[PDB]
Amino acid sequence: PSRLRKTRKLRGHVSHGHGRIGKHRKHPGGRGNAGGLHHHRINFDKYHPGYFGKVGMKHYHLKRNQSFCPTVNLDKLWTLVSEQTRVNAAKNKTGAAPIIDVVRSGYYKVLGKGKLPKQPVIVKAKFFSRRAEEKIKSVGGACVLVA
Amino acid sequence: APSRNGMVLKPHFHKDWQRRVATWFNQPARKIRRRKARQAKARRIAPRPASGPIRPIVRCPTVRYHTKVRAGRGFSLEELRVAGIHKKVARTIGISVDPRRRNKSTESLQANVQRLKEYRSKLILFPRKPSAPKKGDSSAEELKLATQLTGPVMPVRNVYKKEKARVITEEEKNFKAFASLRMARANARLFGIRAKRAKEAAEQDVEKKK
RNA sequence: CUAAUAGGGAACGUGAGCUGGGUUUAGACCGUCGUGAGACAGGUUAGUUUUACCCUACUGAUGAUGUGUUGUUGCCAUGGU
RNA sequence: GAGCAGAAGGGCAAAAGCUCGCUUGAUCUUGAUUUUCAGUACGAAUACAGACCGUGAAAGCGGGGCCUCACGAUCCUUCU
């Protein structure tokens, strides 16, 4: 809505909010990111450190599918299966542990943030972290690798 | 000129973009035109499936999608060979065939020939001359049972094997998943240089012993 | 020569007053400087000087207000000198 | 009232000056801080901490010059 804007309130004020001394001119200072090393250097250094220069090795023809490895933490591991899977295993008299295949749910790596409830579980994944495997074995579970 | 905190923005509007602007006001009309052409085509091929030929089961290429299965371009020639279908008769009875696709494994190959057998069993073949049925199909199976199938023929679904909960064995609890991954990476990294060093040590051993 | 040939101001009074000799465009010559284009509070020659009918000022010319109209003869405020 | 390399100012006497003896702390490192300052950088400087050393009988002192000056981004190159 153009009726809610400052231009309706600036009718009758000669400078339109841009001043009488400095006026509103075309491009004082340059166009775009002009002069980022000369007369806008303070702004670029203050808010964008690291902007200028090269760092690291360049790699031609990056295929992002090769490095596709979504990760899931331990605190969300039991959300990949139904609540019925969880409650049946908890009240199970035998030592049967459900299998959570994180690859089926769309994750490849199991990271170890958080804590697990105290009941065994078999976790299928492409990759595990050291602490994720340690906590899974702590609750009596097992880590099994898939490809 | 930059002003306080902000993002360094690089718009790509330095190249007379206003002369090449694609508006989409004909989008609702294009959807109507496509829909009418779809309906007209389905009427043209009267009892044949409206979507088109049956497509094979195909696994998606990369490591991002190899857990997923979709529909391919056409059945390979090895699949048709063991399904007993001529590669020139297949297209006339609604089987798409891709002569440039090979079969690296027998699991996907056998899954597609089961697909062809099931389609061939579901197929109602009208006689070429309706007065004289030669080898096509009984008149009862096509009197009213022949309808135009809608959607993809036998749509491809991602099946998931359900794993029953089992007692964890003692050997499973002793498997070191992180150590196995670290050692597998190191073994593949150092396989070549270990083979060179072993060969070089063999060179030094034989020359010393001689 | 004369009594004397005092010094000055007025947008260094005064260019819709003039003139245009000078300076101060474009042509050209000389000296000096510069590789050169070119330059010279150096010299020299040739080089378009537009408009007033408006307002005021001023100069003159009719008139105007008040004595009822109109005319003759007059006075002198004031200004100049 | 001399000298301390140099401009000037400060400082300094069994010193910081002069002469000897031994040396390489003018080395390897991570942060913090001060100075200019926007509390950005560079340069310079201060106080530590961890090595490895020097010197001295030792306490200690020393990571350059008694202090205040003596200097230099991105990109590229070159060496380790």
Added chain:
RNA sequence: AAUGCCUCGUCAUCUAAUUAGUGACGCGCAUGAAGGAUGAACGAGAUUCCCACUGUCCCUACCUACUAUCCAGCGAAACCACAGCCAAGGGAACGGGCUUGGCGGAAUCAGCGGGGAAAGAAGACCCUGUUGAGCUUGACUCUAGUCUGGCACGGUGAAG
């Protein structure tokens, strides 16, 4: 000297009087030899003097034609914040307006050139702009053309 700053050089001559002219001199700021120096004729070229001639002047006057002027008819434009009498003050340091004073009397005609810092043109002088263009070169970076080497078209014989 169309070339000399000092300089209106110094001497002579021309005049009553000459920063002018001519002749002469020459350590010549900074003359000078494909241009130097002469020399008739020529020149809408620059300069000085003399005779004659005259309103250029003393020193203005008079006359003639066309205007201007007045009239009938016809009929613009420039320009215009508002306007239009001054002295002083203060003020963007030179007012038509403001302050203080002087004062102020309709509507006009012919003139006039003091003012309106009159009009005409977004100063051409001067500076600034990370605005140009014409030209030059011992600026930077290129380039047509040219010189040169190599390969190919490109072959057959001999002497070195």
Added chain:
RNA sequence: CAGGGGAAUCCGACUGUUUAAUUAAAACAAAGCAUCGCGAAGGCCCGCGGCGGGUGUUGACGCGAUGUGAUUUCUGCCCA
């Protein structure tokens, strides 16, 4: 109808030409003098290109490129 004249100085030899719309000149041109290149597979020049084109229907008493500027008289020294 229809020249004022004379004595000189500077410049340009003269006649010619020139900035249409501020400069008619002492400027340009000029004859004369001098220098340079070239014998044609060439000199100088045009051309995006063609063994293209101009000089050239030419040939050194010619063509091309410069400087100075009639006559007279001279045109000195210097190749760092």
Added chain:
RNA sequence: CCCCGCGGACGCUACGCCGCGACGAGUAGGAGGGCCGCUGCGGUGAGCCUUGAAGCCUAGGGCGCGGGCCCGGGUGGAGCCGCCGCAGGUGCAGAUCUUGGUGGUAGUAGCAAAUAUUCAAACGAGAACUUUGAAGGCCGAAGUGGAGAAGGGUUCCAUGU
């Protein structure tokens, strides 16, 4: 246990109403409110209107701090507005602004290059200018004469206005 009385103002769009205290300059600039204004769309006003819409004019009556608005009179002759939302090519004194129109100047400058006109008559409503006649003059054969080229294109010639 109110009852011879059967009764008792207003209020409180709560985005409303009421009370008390202090305060009020403003360029550049920012913010809020606008029952200020223009145009169009969705709703709504059982809206207005040929018994007279819009627009315009008005020494008419008023309201509001203001932007503005309402009403009377006249002209006009066919459409228009209020409220809740929505959307803008949405508000002018300037820009040596654009286009159009109009003033003062001003009945002014001006209608002054090449010697020159005058008398009578006719036609005609009307004659300095037309036509005829009579004079006086000019071009003066390198013409103000007689013919062509280029260019123009019917200007040629009659008749009429």
Added chain:
RNA sequence: UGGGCCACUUUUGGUAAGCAGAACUGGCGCUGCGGGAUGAACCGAACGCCGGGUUAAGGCGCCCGAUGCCGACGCUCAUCA
């Protein structure tokens, strides 16, 4: 916004300047009002629309509100006060 400027006082260059350059506070710029006749900055005082009272700075012959007080004490005569 990143042109500042002015005044008391301190203060540098300059003969000085309504000059140029600093420090401090205030002001003008952005600000009207009373007074200084007049005036960006001085003196008083800062501002919604008004009535009454009283003041500031400044005044009270007349312009021009207010001494038209029987004001007090002296000083001063200028033919540029």
Added chain:
RNA sequence: CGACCUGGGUAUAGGGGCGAAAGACUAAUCGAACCAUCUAGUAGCUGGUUCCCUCCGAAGUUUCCCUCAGGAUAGCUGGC
């Protein structure tokens, strides 16, 4: 009477022509014609920038910049 004046026909076209040379002339345009387009070229520079009331209310200073008629930056401002 000549390097004379002139008609018509031809040739040369824009970084080109043509010039007895003045940067002259090339259709009132010439130190690079005219026409259309790129193009609404760019401008730290000049001019303008349209209704009302209420509330708050500055800066001409710091640092850096081929920076000095401009910006970034801190400061001062307003709003939530």
Added chain:
RNA sequence: CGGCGACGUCGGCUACCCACCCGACCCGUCUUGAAACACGGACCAAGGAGUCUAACACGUGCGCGAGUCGGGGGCUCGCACGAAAGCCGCCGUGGCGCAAUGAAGGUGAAGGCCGGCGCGCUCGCCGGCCGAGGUGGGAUCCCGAGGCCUCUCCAGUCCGCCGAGGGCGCACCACCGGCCCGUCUCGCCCGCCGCGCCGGGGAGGUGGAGCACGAGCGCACGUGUUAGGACCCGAAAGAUGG
């Protein structure tokens, strides 16, 4: 409490004209400073200048919420409106968020208390619990001795208010610990189909746009910055083709 009232008077005036006293220079603009002898403006009418797109940032409103979003496609008499609306869910592909850090190879965020043991060696095998530590502040909330009442009292019946002190402490702030990735220094252990120039672990510093019980996504609106003709008008120029 008085007077006065229809063809003459009564009241009114913002509005029309005129007179007088005081005050009053012409607006816009740049500017330290304009009435300026600074520029634009003769007059009137109509037109006339911060826009739209994209991308960010923050604020605000709305829906859903560890998710969110169909925008591309498809299905629905193909169509007045309707080019709308509705729906899809094995159309969520995908985007953004949910994980960071390193140039990369890669790695990748749970501790606290009570116990027996090797040696409770700065510590390794477990047990049991609990589930992001602690300090100082901290809105709110909870307890609360003691008071506050009636016509009065010996003696409790029900709850309301004030209340010194005490307690649990939201968000947030300061600080101290802890965890993850990079990089140093020191050091000793552990693993085994590959006994390795293999893999893992510890302590103490330090670098990170991190963790430490999520807050995002989509839509709308506003403001600011930017690229675009970019608030409007304005060069001297440059290029292409005639």
Added chain:
RNA sequence: GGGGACCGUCCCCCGACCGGCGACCGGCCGCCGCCGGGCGCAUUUCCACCGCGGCGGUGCGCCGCGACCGGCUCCGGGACG
């Protein structure tokens, strides 16, 4: 692959107990109110008119006067310490 069982939600029912009849509704009662029709037909009730009537509210068509009270303010007398 089908068919089952189980779990989680649901959608209807067969019944009771619990809180309510509610802002989900009807029937009976009880109270109250209104309306219509009878009866009540006159010291009641209502309607309209008159008094230059009174008590209230508001307000005088215009122009004016006075009084006392209160707020603020400028003055003047008188008296006491």
Added chain:
RNA sequence: CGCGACCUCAGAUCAGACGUGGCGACCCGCUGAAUUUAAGCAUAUUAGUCAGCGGAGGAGAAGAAACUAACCAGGAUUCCCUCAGUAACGGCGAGUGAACAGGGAAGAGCCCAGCGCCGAAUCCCCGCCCCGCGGCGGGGCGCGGGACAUGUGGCGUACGGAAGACCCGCUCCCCGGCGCCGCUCGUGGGGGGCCCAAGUCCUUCUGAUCGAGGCCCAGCCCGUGGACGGUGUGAGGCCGGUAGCGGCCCCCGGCGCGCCGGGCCCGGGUCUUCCCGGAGUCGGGUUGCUUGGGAAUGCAGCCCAAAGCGGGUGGUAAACUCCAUCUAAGGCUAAAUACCGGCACGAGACCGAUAGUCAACAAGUACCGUAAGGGAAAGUUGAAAAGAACUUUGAAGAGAGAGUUCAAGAGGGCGUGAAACCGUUAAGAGGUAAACGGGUGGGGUCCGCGCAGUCCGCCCGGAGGAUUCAACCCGGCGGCGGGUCCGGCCGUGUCGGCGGCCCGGCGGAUCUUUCCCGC
């Protein structure tokens, strides 16, 4: 020193055909800047863009891998979403910048050369006869010509192919036609033509009305039609239209059956024996351009110049090695996609005559320039011309009367008719240019139903009228309350789940045949 055959050339107004030029919005091939940004500027950017040249079509181009990948692999091209403002390029500055995978729209595949076999099996032309004319074919004939072994046709093309055997299946294609089709298919297929509901009812307004009231019946009449336009206002019913899987007439076209006629010719599996490929091209060097392509992505010039278990690619130059993947240097191909030109339509929160196209109109017109080119202004009487007969003054323009009209205070640039500016009339004023702010005063024009001044509640008194008041009865309707008085219920639990995988659903990353159809 002649005649023939061939080869290579030439001429012809030879017989029959074809091309040229236009448009050019979209498409293909080239060529190709600078303004601009970088706060200067040269690389870069603008931009492979404007301008320039050529070539097409209803689409074009592309296109069936010398591909992507590195996976558990996908599988022509084109388009959309996403990848992604990413990898990368870049005075690593300003800036630039794809692809793969994934999801969709669409979906379609093929043909030669070569190697071989088959008596050149092949093709064009000219005559003759017949069936038909429609994009000129068929059939037959010609000791009729020519092309062609310097290679036509059939088979066949990397997905392998061919020939023989052996076995199995006889399976059935295309085209032109007669009669009729069902007739086509979101409801005939398309084009053209002609038609199809209901008020001009009563009373009124007006110049004219389509306006305003009314039309008892459940409501004037029709409505599958209440879109729109015209008509003297503003109309569902006055007219054209609108609605309708409405009607009638004519023409054209694409799907079958019975039949006609013509061509029309073997397919698969196994075994054996054979056969297999595009060269001044790839590739390398160098140069210039181009790209995100970075020790060189693509393109081109010049030089070098291949191979055959080879060659290309495998995003860092090189050697060795393994592996993967394709098969270049020949060709065709629909769909999805594009479309500011054209033909014909529909619509709009757009503009409303200085706006919107330059152009609402005799507009690319008038006019300007030698030319390339530049380029306007300009809409409105009235319902109907009923467009002012006639008289009169004047030479006429122009007037005064008269007349038409609802209106000429609508009179042919004529709807309305502002401001600036001007004339006249009326009022007021005038020597400090006008104009303005504050305060009064005077005059004037209007306004006030001004001119004896409000009103209304209760009470008192006076004189009058009356469906006449309270209380009771009958009926109707409400409001409030009632242990639930009675139902109907509502929330929360609460049990047999009798009741729902038959006799109720939807789900579940929960278990199973241990009854059932696929190893």
